[PDB]
From a paper:
Membrane-bound pyrophosphatases (M-PPases) are enzymes that couple the synthesis or hydrolysis of pyrophosphate (PPi) to the vectorial transport of protons and/or sodium ions. In addition, M-PPases can be divided into seven functional classes on the basis of their monovalent cation binding (K+-dependent and K+-independent enzymes) and pumping specificity (H+-pumps (H+-PPases), Na+-pumps (Na+-PPases) and H+ and Na+ co-pumps (Na+/H+-PPases)) and on the placement of a ‘semi-conserved glutamate' essential for pumping activity. These structures have shown that M-PPases are homodimers, with each protomer having 16 transmembrane helices (TMHs) and a vertically arranged, continuous active site structure with four distinctive parts: ‘hydrolytic centre', ‘coupling funnel', ‘ion gate' and ‘exit channel'3. In this article we present three structures: the Na+-pumping TmPPase with IDP and Na+ bound (TmPPase:IDP) at 3.5 Å resolution, the H+-pumping VrPPase with one phosphate bound (VrPPase:Pi) at 3.5 Å resolution, and the newly refined structure of TmPPase with the phosphate analogue, WO4 bound, at 4 Å resolution (TmPPase:WO4).
In TmPPase:IDP, an Mg5IDP-complex was fit into the positive Fo–Fc density in the hydrolytic centre and then refined. The coordination of Mg2+ and IDP is almost identical to that seen in VrPPase:IDP12, even though the two enzymes pump different ions. Positive Fo–Fc density was seen in TmPPase:IDP between residues D6.50, E6.53, S6.54 and D16.46. Close to this, K16.50, which forms an ion-triplet in the resting-state TmPPase structure with D6.50 and E6.53, adopts a different orientation and the K16.50 Nζ is disordered. In TmPPase, sodium binding is facilitated by the inward motion of D16.46 into the sodium-binding site and by the movement of TMHs 6 and 16, which is almost twice as big as that in VrPPase. These helical movements bring D6.50, E6.53 and S6.54 to the correct position to bind Na+ and move K16.50 away from the binding site.
Numbering used by the authors:
A (entry chain B), B (entry chain A): 2 to 726
Write the structure that this text describes.
């Protein structure tokens, strides 16, 4: 059937990724010295990611076994699968970037043009994007085919009850396991890599620029290699796992909602249950987001393929925007026909929230897509120095450091309102068209072109690394200016991707609130009306107290991450000072600095600290649940969603703005004052403040929300009646 | 009756305030220079507060008229009354502090002991505390006696419906007007004063300390007078209006809840309304928080008098802590007998949430008190340099400025979890004992000794001013050390007071959620069960979207305040640079700097910016309500409560910790590095970052929550059915 043809699409995506890999590795590579340093970075990155992968997969096996014990084994299986998929996305991403980075450098060096570097960098990110979409939908469609069709978990869709008292739906619990795996792995990865790269970058930039008057990425600085290796580890793999888990999060959210919808919407007539919605419609609504995601992936492929070729323009940001726009538009247009034809005659839609026929989920999809796009636009507005706010931030450096920090935090706080409002109208309209299912599908719509988003976002770290390499070998300033252009653009794309992630996370979070309320239902209370189930009252003390708690947990989470960064950051600062002092000829370029120490500090600290956050995210709903019940947990999830929603956008836009303001002054756009000036130092301090926020605190929330909510959805059946207080 | 005797108590409080005023003003003024500078500061402060009071009272008259039009005239009357009360608290506070600071300075100069300065400063704050409690309970009891007893608005307590379709309860609407007045005035005052003092302080500290190597509060600096005048305007009057409005907020919250409880708790038996709770019980529960607050005031008076007459010890923090502890304890003990005797035989307790007899609200009160105290303890822990976190923050300055900022924000975020948890258990337990009424009374309990809290908190600005004056006139360093001690202590007390404020604000916010749900009921819908009324479903799209929006509004609010500060801050920085450049002999102490310009900048900017925030706080529930209904507004209130709860504590504790870390290094507690070193500059920058956060952003939230929630509670009856979408 056509099903197999759609099953080909992720495989074609993987093939495209491998093709781009081959195309980029084909590049001639700059210099033997460049190859050497790049090989060093490869060694460090591969090492750290190896230790990471080891520990995280150990923990993943443990958790998976625990799931197979306390739930269905299919849960643990899908868990391991998704784990492998996300981890593989990370590994492929890094292994690609580490080799891809040199090509950009040589391109900009020889051609002295932005075009080539832009192209190779874009292909570099493309590999990772296609890897993300491909892996996600591959694992997903594997779960779907194997567990849903062969085992017939989509067949029954009735409320079950295994031992220990957990009320579950087989397929729902399975995909729950999948998404949970993805979330845990993503969290571990990006926390570790995050702390690593941010400690390294903070120390390097701070001491190097402000305490030694060294240029950015100077080989005299023993911390620069740590910065680049960190860029390869954190800003890359973490992003892949992140947006993969966000994509999966949205789709699996839709699937769970749809699946739980069927056995619940019964009408109790004289002790007889009457299914108000037929099984066929439900199954169709279960398969719908998968085929959706496949089509979206395809369109993303069309867009990316169109871009990597094409007549290269002198403006990269415009090109990437064209990529996203074309991918999104194609996605919309094809989704129209997909939605119309697939859901043509089901008749049972009117009962479960469909207002305007069967074209409703396409409308909700459009809502999600347009929402994501607007988020991108706003993010770019607040972070790029081509506009007012970042220009003001950079220009404000004349007044001091305190002004940089203050106006930075202010910018962060102000930049919250537009995408949040966009999300509000998004939720309201999606709910208007197709209700909760509409919201769940809108979450997917925002990330329907996840491949292009991940690509455009991953385009940045390659540029940053290319700059780091360009500075180390003392090249023509054309290389540095081009690479700085690409790097600033990348910094914008990061903020954009973050916005997408947190938005989709929020829609999916609402849908997961719905599913969470559904999951509480036992086979005995199957007759209860849907309206009485979907009820999470704020005036209940446990619920609002829950919200407050969850909020505080999010904030303390952020604080813990920041502290974790500042530890190795400080230690490395002291290390840089000590090396600059005790090594003669180091600052004169007549003595090679000890990079391995700087590597060791952040590596050790990251490996040590990385454990706690994920464990907290997993155990919180458990302990709060067993202590105070399900309502309290619902509250916790709410507060978490809100506070995470705010802090993510804040940190993202603020950090991006700070960095791009630094790069703004570094481009000499501010008259008189330059790289060695005091305002430059102020913007540098600002950037070092924004670093642990934008690349460690921000996304960790968008993961934490989904993992915590899914854990809650799964475990709720236990402490719903087995709560202590 | 005994009622008149209790009505005497606030008058005795005012008398005590006047007595302390006379006692302190009798103290000797140091030197003609001190008198001159103090007269200057007095002139500036009185001027700014005059303009402020003028504009704010114009707006207040307008709003009051609007209330008299669209609601009962009693609403507008009580509005004006409360307005006058809060404003008067501010005016008295400032007018007292401005004179007290010299007494403190001269005391520390002559005696070279901590005791005297501590005592006179404490009496200085005492005047303001007694002014706050006194004014609040005076206006409140005036409303009670006049509108409740003479007019008989406590008599009817039936659901009414005036023109325009607003369903109201007379007394409830009245005290709503009262609290609203207090909130609007407090907001205006502390926003204006906040921006004023913070721009000045930021510029002064930054340029003075780090760019000129000048000592803090050096007369060579043209911005120091602006800083001191600001301390008198912002940190004083703003605090008075703030905590007065918080006190009033809690009490009026209880009153509104209790009042609305009667016509709502009817049982519909065959088209017949059956009051499940008698009127006597309801009225008793209405009077209860007032007499509660009166007793608390009395106990506060006992504590304060005990301290001011006590034998002065070399340790101030211990003395203030003893004050708070004794006040709280006395409050508890007397409240026990009050609660037992007053609520002896009411019969209606079992129906409306009272679990353990009639002693329940005393238990909830104890919960609130202990909660507030614990908040104080945690605040002191995180902010004082006598403990680990602030010490680490100060010591971290060796690693750079970015580390100071990062660890500061980290401290802020981490310090959120303990008092939030305290508030969670507080809410849960209060609800366990006496439900929503329990929570509402707990809000009062936390601030039962509001006089002592305001006193202890206001003790600080006087000390800070004493230090500024001592430095300006070039005195013995022992004076500076004493005043620095007292000032750091003051900085701790500030954080404590903020914690109290936001806590009480949150409890009262829950109770106001309840009252908000109550207010929607029309006379036709009077028969509806209480359980179905108290329902705010999160899964409703409007509600969660509301939460997101409100959250974003809180964040953008904070951002706007920060920006407003940074405007005049930057302008003043440029002014200081310009004066230092163009005025010869300025830095040599041979030319008097132009302070009036620095005054003018912050004055103009503050007067300009102060308008918007209050207007937003008032208009948001209106526009969002008319647009999307009552549920959406409920959501907005939720998100507002949560985000405000987090940001307030964050900014407060972070700012306090930063400041006391600066003071920690300035005391030479960090070996080797001193006032002129680079780590000192780092801590200075950190302090300038924390300044606009803790003294402009923080409390503004605790006001915004209550003003917005009250406005919503009042206006809800209109757009509940006259909503556009
Ligand atoms: Mg950097
Ligand atoms: Mg980097
Ligand atoms: Mg770099
Ligand atoms: Mg960057
Ligand atoms: Mg950085
Ligand atoms: Mg200061
Ligand atoms: Mg001050
Ligand atoms: Mg001062
Ligand atoms: Mg201070
Ligand atoms: Mg300050
Ligand atoms: Na994610
Ligand atoms: Na207040």
């Amino acid at each position: 059937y056509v099903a197999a043809l759609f099953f080909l699409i992720p495989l074609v995506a993987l093939g495209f990724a491998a093709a781009n890999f081959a195309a980029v590795v084909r590049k001639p590579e700059g210099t033997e010295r460049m190859k050497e340093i790049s090989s060093y970075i490869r060694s460090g990155a591969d090492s750290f990611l190896a230790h990471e992968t080891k520990a995280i997969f150990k923990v993943a096996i443990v958790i998976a076994i625990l799931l197979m014990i306390f739930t269905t084994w299919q849960t643990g299986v899908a868990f391991l699968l998704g784990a492998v998929m996300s981890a593989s996305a990370g590994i492929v991403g890094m292994k690609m970037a580490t080799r891809a980075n040199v090509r950009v450098a040589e391109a900009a060096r020889t051609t002295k043009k932005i075009g080539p570097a832009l192209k190779v960098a874009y292909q570099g990110g493309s590999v990772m994007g296609l890897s993300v979409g491909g892996f996600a939908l591959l694992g997903l469609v594997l779960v779907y085919l194997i567990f849903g069709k062969w085992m017939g978990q989509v067949d029954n869709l009735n409320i079950y009850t295994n031992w220990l008292g957990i009320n579950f739906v087989p397929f729902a619990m399975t995909v729950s396991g999948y998404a949970l795996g993805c979330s845990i792995i993503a969290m571990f990865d990006r926390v570790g890599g995050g702390v690593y790269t941010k400690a390294a970058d903070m120390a390097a930039d701070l001491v190097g620029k402000t305490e030694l008057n060294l240029p950015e990425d100077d080989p005299r600085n023993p911390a620069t290699i740590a910065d680049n290796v960190g860029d390869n580890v954190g800003d890359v793999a973490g992003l892949g796992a992140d947006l993969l888990e966000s994509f999966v999060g949205a789709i699996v959210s839709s699937i769970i909602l749809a699946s739980y919808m069927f056995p619940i919407y019964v009408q109790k007539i004289g002790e007889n249950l009457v299914h108000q919605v037929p099984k066929e419609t439900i199954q169709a609504l279960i398969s719908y987001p998968i085929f959706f995601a496949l089509v979206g992936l395809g369109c993303s492929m069309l867009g990316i393929l169109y871009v990597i070729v094409k007549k290269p323009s002198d403006n990269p940001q415009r090109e990437l925007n064209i990529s996203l726009w074309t991918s999104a538009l194609l996605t919309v247009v094809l989704t129209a026909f997909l939605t119309y034809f697939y859901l043509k005659d089901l008749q049972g839609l009117d009962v479960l929230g469909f207002r305007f026929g069967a074209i409703s989920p396409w409308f909700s999809a459009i809502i999600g897509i347009f929402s994501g796009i607007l988020i991108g636009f706003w993010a770019e507005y607040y972070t790029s120095y081509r506009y007012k706010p970042t220009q003001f931030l950079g220009k404000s450096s004349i007044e001091g450091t305190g002004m940089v920090i203050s106006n930075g935090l202010s910018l962060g706080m102000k930049s919250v309102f537009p995408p949040t409002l966009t999300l509000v109208l998004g939720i309201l309209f999606a709910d208007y068209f197709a209700g909760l299912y509409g919201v769940a599908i809108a979450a997917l719509g925002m990330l329907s072109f996840v491949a292009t988003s991940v690509s455009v976002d991953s385009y940045g770290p390659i540029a940053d690394n290319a700059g780091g390499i360009s500075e180390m070998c003392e090249l023509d300033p054309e290389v540095r200016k081009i690479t700085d252009h690409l790097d600033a653009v990348g910094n914008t794309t990061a903020a954009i991707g973050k916005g997408f992630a947190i938005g989709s996370a929020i829609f999916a979070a609402l849908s997961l609130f719905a599913s969470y309320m559904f999951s509480q239902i036992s086979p005995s209370d199957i007759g209860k009306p849907p309206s009485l189930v979907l009820l999470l009252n704020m005036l209940d003390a446990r619920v609002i107290a829950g919200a407050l708690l969850g909020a505080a947990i999010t904030y303390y989470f952020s604080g813990y991450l920041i502290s974790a960064v500042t530890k190795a950051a400080m230690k490395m600062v002291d290390e840089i000072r000590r090396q600059a002092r005790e090594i003669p000829g180091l600052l004169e370029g007549k003595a090679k600095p000890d990079y391995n120490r700087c590597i060791e500090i952040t590596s050790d600290n990251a490996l040590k600290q990385m454990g706690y956050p994920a464990f907290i995210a997993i155990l919180t709903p458990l302990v709060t649940g067993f202590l105070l019940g399900a309502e309290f947990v619902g509250g916790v999830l709410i507060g978490t969603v809100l506070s995470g929603a705010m802090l993510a956008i804040l940190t993202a836009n603020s950090g991006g703005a700070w960095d791009n303001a630094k790069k703004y002054l570094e481009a000499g756009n501010l008259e008189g004052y330059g790289k060695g000036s005091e305002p430059h130092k102020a913007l540098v301090i600002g950037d070092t403040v924004g670093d642990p926020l934008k690349d460690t605190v921000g996304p960790s929330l968008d993961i934490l929300i989904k993992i915590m909510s899914v854990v809650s959805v799964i475990a709720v059946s236990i402490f719903k009646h087995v709560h202590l207080f």
